[model samples]
Target chain A: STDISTVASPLFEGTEGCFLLYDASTNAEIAQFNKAKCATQMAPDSTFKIALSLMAFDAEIIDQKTIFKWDKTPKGMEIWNSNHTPKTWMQFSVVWVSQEITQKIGLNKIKNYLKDFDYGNQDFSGDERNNGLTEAWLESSLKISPEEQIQFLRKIINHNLPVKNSAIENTIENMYLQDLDNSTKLYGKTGAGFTANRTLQNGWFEGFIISKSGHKYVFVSALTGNLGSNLTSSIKAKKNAITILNTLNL
Target chain B: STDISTVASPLFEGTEGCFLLYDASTNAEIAQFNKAKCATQMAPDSTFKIALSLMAFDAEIIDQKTIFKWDKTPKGMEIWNSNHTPKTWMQFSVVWVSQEITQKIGLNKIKNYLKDFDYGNQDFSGDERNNGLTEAWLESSLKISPEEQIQFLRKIINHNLPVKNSAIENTIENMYLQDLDNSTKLYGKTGAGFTANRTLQNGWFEGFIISKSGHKYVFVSALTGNLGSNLTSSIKAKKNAITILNTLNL
Candidate 1:
């Protein structure tokens, strides 16, 4: 792994995080910022949705047209105020939809999927075991480092793992963020996992950029913060990661 | 100049535009999606702010702290419903502020600055001439292409142009968007120029991505539409360009 010196910017002033960029074109590590934190493990947070979405699709738990009806229960976030299809579910990161999907998939299947996907720690044992859905990627035993996150994403992008191509394709389609002048497709998921005290603990932004000329680059950023820190949210993590990545001129 | 072919994506469907990416590290053209449109010059519309911002700063007409008082005039756009600093003025693309600044600077000074910057066509004659600050970039005389936009941005990034470093730095600071994990700084402005009928004709997003390693990639997206087409608004053009740029994974 090539170590890239940390880029100094006010944006990362108060945050402890890791950023890993891998260039699949040359099969080399392009750059790793915050090298120490890059290897630190934390909850995958909502970023696990990238894998969960695939599992749900592969297990036939949901399809492209599947719309999960909102229970009409306010989850405290105004964005959760609508019926969500699988697409919007990822877009909004609706917890309820993930909860329902996980409930249907159950613990055993989740364990199996995690194992097959080689997800970090591969642990699903948590208090939510009763509901079999909540907080697994949150305060649960499942934790992944920024480096591992990038590795998993690369597998997903290359279809190297044991999953249906359609499932991978579907997840990729739903991860739509932006197109680089029709020359590259950027896709990824953002995750925000909190602590038992309801304070933000870890945040993640992971995705890949693939060019038309077959050049591919994957990146993962993980942000960790102490309790009461404003930098703990997924939004903040994403902002930091994006600001940093933009410097790459990718 | 090397030509990078456009990647296939649905994002560019129905949009007639050009996207150009240039890498400053290698001092080479990274990609050009549409060569013809990339070279074709059209009214730069609001994108001229890249130059105007500098011109205003250099002429001592507006500084980083300069603020434009709101006439409290309703411009229909919610963002323009308040007083504007040079920063917010560009953010909301408030026309009144631009008009006011241009008027203060006058045509001759504007002409000299344009000449100094080698701005495209260096023409400011437009319908707003009666007001002393007409639409030089909006359906008037000023014109630029995506290629030229990138060129201008490259100069700005390098402080290669004739503007004060402070002015350039201030404008860059105010142009902040998302932070990518504190590793890179992304700065640029968006412009939407319209026609006499109040229909959108041209949309532009020009900016540069500078890495901590001193890598810089400048991008310019120029969007155009036929009269009365749904695709003509600067807002729409901005969205298209952004969506496409996002795909670059930067």
Candidate 2:
């Protein structure tokens, strides 16, 4: 019942953003900033990894200890040049590891899962330069809105997704961020990318929190801006989300 | 003061730890667990980076933009084997980065700063394995307790130390963690190491908070444990601290 619209706005002064928070206990919207934009669809970028993770796990392509060795193919960041497990892949947001998970899951099964989940757009067509199977969500063929992101997380928390219970649990475990103040367990992933024209940054932070107070909520925060700085819009999206969460009673 | 004694116990179930929190605005103790243990001192480990950062800036040995390049020597963690700025050095909790800082600020100057800061046991003498100049804080001679850590942080926030205004300001900015709820600005550092006897784990989380409500606080949380699995004692030190903070209003 607290207004996040105003609080969310200033945190994103130069940037345009959409934030959606829902109370899962009753599946009602608690508050939102730019509801129209929250409904507007854009490429999921790395936030797609959340869904992809379930796909990888439900299909039995990977498990808790699955390790993907670094092929030593130069990726710009040094952290990418090493072995990663399911946990690290999610933690580091490694594209190759996600791609590897895609390959292991196979294209058809991925489509089957996506359609079953009623995921956004669900387009499997690759963009002009990349394969749909490995890169559709990266500012390409596949797209999702903040509302949809919230819905997906809701299903994951409720075990309402078209996935095995263990797969859902594992995906949740992999996304564990940190235990914040309150007896709340935080689970989320952060993502960033430019628009197709590469002019504006498309950043996202979405996840669910479970409180000992018996309140469960799912939130999606997205930021877009042409601002110049070391702080990515996605990073801002997360920071702003934290400030907003802190203001709320949740 | 809700006695954190019980809540803190199970969190470090198999371990021994101490936690102390104070309302800086009043300079009065708020709550604590294991008061006697909280007074116990041990090697500063990575937590010493906070005082060292202040010393580096106070002595004019480094600034915000100072960058230390990778020496091409492999550390146990690959992430540590790269270049780091003062910001990244603290963010990543890089040990070599802090040691290099110690060497840059010679013994006499380091002594002056430590004495001025009243930093714990200010012993620059190293252990049997390394020189005091570069290795004193790493399970070596320099030691501090939860109480001492709080006092040191209190001075930094109050600008009570014999350091330059910019030095104090820069040190606070670099150790910045993130903004929390109630418009609270979190600034803290984390540290971890094993006992000199290489038995129990030594963990620490200490920092200050500035809140919009005109409340300011300085807290020090230290954990000691001989447990198994991937969760480091220092990490649990931080996690447990969050739990305790949530239980109280700072």
Candidate 3:
């Protein structure tokens, strides 16, 4: 097993979890910790949208304002719009609208773009979860090692590959509201989903940045609890996440 | 190579993709295409946010409403913000502000989350462009096989995984716009980014659903072009995506 950093919160308990961070430029593990439970994979939920939206644009399958009439709504989802109207959808933040497009776009095009995504292979067995491409977008939980997260951020920071710079900016601009440093210009998106308390399940955040220096560093994270997504318990957990981030030294 | 159903617009020439509609107790791949390209991975870009945000929340690293004040903005990024005032970044939509949280949360937590992720052990090479976690998030050019996309979505729908169901709902709810069906209650998210376009680059979408029938399906797609993310070209591609999805016989 890989060695990790010492943690200040012993209440975190056990060795089932992991943590990691790396220098954007060098890909060095600037920080690391338990690799067991910490490295567990969870459903990407909405966080996967950050990547899917970019893929849609890159494949020339869609544009920024290409609004579609959403016909079907999923069960167990918390819509930002308490008032549901196709026209009302236009009033949504670009961040919200961008992710909504995925459902209408169908899974074919998404699978097409993902064909080129270089993430790990789906390891689950059986017809229930054997479709790797589908799993990449739906079934397979997004499993990232601490080292992997650091390296993923480095690519976004550098923009060294064949993506459209404009799409990158738009994706970050809409879904990204991190605002770590307006001057330095950091950006990001996030996602997560899990079954907790035996019955409740959910997910959260995934995003990236175009740094003040004009480079990029993508980041993602998520949480899941058995409580309903809209439940006060879940909302409180989300708020706690904000406080944790607020107190951070970054 | 898996031959899945996918759009053939000039926009999505060879990427792997899928459109899935699952029935209770059984799953089906309603659409897919390009097995050869479907599994490939590219830089995850904003998509990396899915992992980062989830980790922050799950590891108790960051909460949903942690507010922050940004003093700077990224150069060349095209987001239309009302103002650059210092504000509390309590939600997951803010990207720049999120960076500050990342610094405080440190790499250790992020890495630990990755290790415990369902799809842990993703590659994180030193190079951001070719093959590593950086590439997965930042144009790393990593591929997610078509089969994998479907696989992951199934986990969310079945509610049989480690992720919290409500957290997944929250994350998805944040990204998309909503139009409610008084009877069906559908919900989803959209994602987009510029890709390989001199004029338009951010064209992408990825998301999932908890269908009226109580099943889930997530997807990823891309459309690269020579226009800006808001260009007509981008819109044209996205429109084509609608046609592709509407044709899904599920």
Query: Which candidate wins on lDDT?
Result: 2
**For residues B1-250, could you state the per-residue lDDT of candidate 1 as single tens digits?**
4443445224444557777778854558876676788888787766777677887887778886777765433567788866789888777778777877788888888888877777777767665335336566766767777777777777777788777888887777767765444456567677765555655466777787776666778877666665465434566555655555555554
lDDT of 2 by residue, B19-78 (tens): 888877567888888888788988878888888888888778887778886644456788
* Candidate 2 residue-wise lDDT at A238: 85
**What's the chain B TM-score of candidate 2?**
0.93
Question: For candidate 1, what is the DockQ?
Answer: 0.01
lDDT of 2 at B92: 84
Candidate 2 C-alpha error for residue B176, in Å: 63
Order by DockQ, highest first = 3, 2, 1
Query: Tell me, what's the RMSD of every candidate?
Result: 23.4, 21.3, 28.9
Quantify all predictions' global Cα lDDT against the true fold. Answer: 0.73, 0.81, 0.42
lDDT (Cα, tens digit) per residue for candidate 2, span A177-239: 886666577788998888886678889999988777867899998987896645387888888
Q: What is the TM-score of each predicted model, taking all chains together?
A: 0.47, 0.50, 0.38
Alpha-carbon deviation at A45 in model 3, angstroms = 45
Q: lDDT (0-100) at residue A194 of candidate 3?
A: 42
Candidate number with the higher lDDT (2 or 3): 2
Q: Which numbered prediction scores highest in TM-score against the true structure?
A: 2
